[PDB]
Amino acid sequence: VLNDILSRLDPPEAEVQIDRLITGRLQSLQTYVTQQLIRAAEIRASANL
Amino acid sequence: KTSVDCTMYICGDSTECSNLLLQYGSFCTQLNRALTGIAVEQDKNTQE
């Protein structure tokens, strides 16, 4: 939970913890976007058929 | 039809490594599901 970190720690370590969280969530989002792109390519092939 | 054991590949026979990997959530499940989907797609391709 971002709010817990931002309430329990000061910037010098809060920003490291938030760096870790941002890295994880950004990797998750990029994976999701790649999956959506692939599935949309499949669905567009089906739509053209 | 390749299939990769995510937890065994990343964290081969290490309980501590598995506990650390659990911090990353469902990534392993995503990869395994994707590979299973590919395998099923291949069998569907051959069948059709």
- Tokens at residue A2, please? 């971002």
Q: How far apart are CA B17 and CA A12, in angstroms?
A: 27
Q: Looking at residue B23, what DSSP letter applies?
A: G
Resolution, Å (one decimal) = 4.8
CB B30 within 8 A of CB A31: yes
Residues 12-41 in A contacting B (C-alpha not used; CB under 8 Å): 24, 27-28, 31, 35
CB contact under 8 A, B34 and A28: no
Which residues of chain B neighbour A28 with C-beta distances below 8 Å? 25, 27
Q: How far apart are CA A5 and CA B9, in angstroms?
A: 32
The neighbour count for residue B28, using CB atoms within 10 Å, is: 20
* Experimental technique: cryo-EM
Q: How far apart are CA A48 and CA A46, in angstroms?
A: 5
